[PDB]
Amino acid sequence: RRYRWRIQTAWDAGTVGYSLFQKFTERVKELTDGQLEVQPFPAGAVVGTFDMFDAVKTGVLDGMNPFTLYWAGRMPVTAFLSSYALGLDRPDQWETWFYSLGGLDIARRAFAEQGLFYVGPVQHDLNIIHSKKPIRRFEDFKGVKLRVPGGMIAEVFAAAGASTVLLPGGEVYPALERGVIDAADFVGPAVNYNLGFHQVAKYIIMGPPETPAIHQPVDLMDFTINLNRWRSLPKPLQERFIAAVHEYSWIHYAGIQKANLEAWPKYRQAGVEVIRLSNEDVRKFRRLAIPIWFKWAKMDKYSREAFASQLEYMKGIGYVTDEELKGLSL
Amino acid sequence: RRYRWRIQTAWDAGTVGYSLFQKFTERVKELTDGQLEVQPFPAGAVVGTFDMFDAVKTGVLDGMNPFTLYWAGRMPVTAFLSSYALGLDRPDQWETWFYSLGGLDIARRAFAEQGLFYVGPVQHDLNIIHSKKPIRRFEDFKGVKLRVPGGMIAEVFAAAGASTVLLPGGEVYPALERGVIDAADFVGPAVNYNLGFHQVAKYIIMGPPETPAIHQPVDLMDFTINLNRWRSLPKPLQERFIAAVHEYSWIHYAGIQKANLEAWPKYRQAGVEVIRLSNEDVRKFRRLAIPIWFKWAKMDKYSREAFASQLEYMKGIGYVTDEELKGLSL
Ligand SMILES: [Zn+2]
Ligand SMILES: [Zn+2]
């Protein structure tokens, strides 16, 4: 039999991300000899981006390709299924945690409880911030109306004095154009350029060379399927889909990075100034971030289990010291 | 029909690498519904490790899973299909170069001329060095009889004054034991421990925290199949094997990294001391390395094509400056 799944992505039509997503649907068809076809839908075509979770749960959408931390408000563990401020910051570290340190199994158990099947993470990129005004040091975040993807990312910036707001990436351009917000994080350079942020914001704010991305160094996406639909798919096809997603994870990653290399010269051409924060600004964010990591970990049994193993890993590779964990518990 | 392929790996029996490789053949069987069965063979079981290239070319072996730079002496481009001293040093950078910047197509074209189908790279790990006597700085390399995997890696150490020797990892232990060599690089901590290096060498030599691996930060493996055997495989199975290898690339990478985390405590227990070189030491190696990059790049049309796009990429991410390239050119 042939199966057809309808999957909407967080990528807006007309972005490098959507183009990569379109090709993935062709690859799935090739890998399953046409037995499984995925019909792609750009952000907002079936439902709003943040409404994808419920639509996939009901089966109205067969699956979704979101940025995983979008569900942080309803599933605490998802704040730990994508990068959070100053924690693990390399694609290979997240890949290791998910694929050998138990991360994938935590995600699958948590999503199964929601009637969803978490297939696996899709590698992507770090994120940058676009601002209408110069933010040159930690203290300049005070009073900035900043769009961020909620969750722990928003909490960290709020602890730095920013007024945070949650908006889908597609609403950032009009918000900055009208001055409804002063700044916005979204994704990396290439897609932000596709969305025109450079024309409504003259600055790009990044961390120092040592920590380019303070908040989201590894902004993971994923594929999540309605559990019933997943369980109805023949096992051989389920296994091929898992392989297709893991292969795509890196094909997506590479395509985004190539587009990013091409985008930087364009920002310079557009007259956009890239502001680099300092190592000291990062330390100020670090002191705010660690206690917040623990508060989020303490939300439910899944966030605790995921952070516990991530913390152990961070200790093993020198990303956290016992001294800085003083007074914190788990 | 059902296809059966014998594929030998550079991993010795009894290593974490070989266990991961055995699992991959089961994964291939599952992904192809039993149509493609790869019978795994540990290093030296069918042919010698360095004989795999000719064994596969002539068909004695259907395919191989080697460390790609083993063929540097016969195919100059392979010295650029795996990490080399002080160039790109993160797994994600090599993934990007191969999958979006044209790297994969260069490898495939170069191998096709040899009657081989290069499937894709297999991520792995950085490498560390084990020594019988301490090597605490750049100058301590003079006079050291050092085992390395030849090619550009051997040439950089020779430039530092070491007497290099080429040996399969499975022959490092006896070579150290009987004093044939003073030190040896091979792979990461877990597998080196599997091979018992800690029993014949009390030191591990690594770069500073900023540059843990000076010579081989991304020691890639790959799958290469006899071209005729590849062409006789139905296209649907060719595509599934390609996806399987790419998925495995990271499953392998993650498994190796987990094992590495578990190995450090065993080295401490075995009484092995980890010596870290300095940033100054890295600079001394750097001044030798860069000119060597160009020497190897100019070897043939493929080594030139590969290095050309890698240099362009490194320039793009600030890994090299025009200043330090003064007087060097393709
Ligand atoms: Zn973001
Ligand atoms: Zn090596």
UniProtKB/Swiss-Prot annotation, chains A, B:
Presence of the UniProt keyword Cell membrane in the record: no
Parts of the chain that traverse the membrane: none
Binding-site residues for substrate, renumbered to this chain: 70, 127, 147, 186, 216-219
Principal place of residence: periplasm
Domain of life: Bacteria
Sites where the protein binds Ca(2+): 127, 185-186, 216
Keyword terms of this UniProt record: Calcium, Metal-binding, Periplasm, Signal, Transport
Swiss-Prot/TrEMBL GO biological process terms: lactate transport; transmembrane transport
Compartments it resides in: Periplasm
Pfam families hit by this protein: DctP (PF03480)
GO CC annotations on file: periplasmic space; tripartite ATP-independent periplasmic transporter complex
Molecular-function annotations in GO: calcium ion binding; protein homodimerization activity; zinc ion binding
Annotated InterPro entries: DctP_fam, SBP_TakP-like, TAT_signal, TRAP_DctP_sf, TTHA0766
Family stated for the protein in its record: Belongs to the bacterial solute-binding protein 7 family.
PANTHER family, alphabetized: EXTRACYTOPLASMIC SOLUTE RECEPTOR PROTEIN (PTHR33376:SF5), PTHR33376
Subunit structure: Homodimer. The complex comprises the extracytoplasmic solute receptor protein TTHA0766, and the two putative transmembrane proteins TTHA0767 and TTHA0768.
Function description: Part of the tripartite ATP-independent periplasmic (TRAP) transport system involved in the uptake of lactate. This protein specifically binds L-lactate.
Protein name: Lactate-binding periplasmic protein TTHA0766
Organism (species): Thermus thermophilus (strain ATCC 27634 / DSM 579 / HB8)
Lineage: Bacteria, Thermotogati, Deinococcota, Deinococci, Thermales
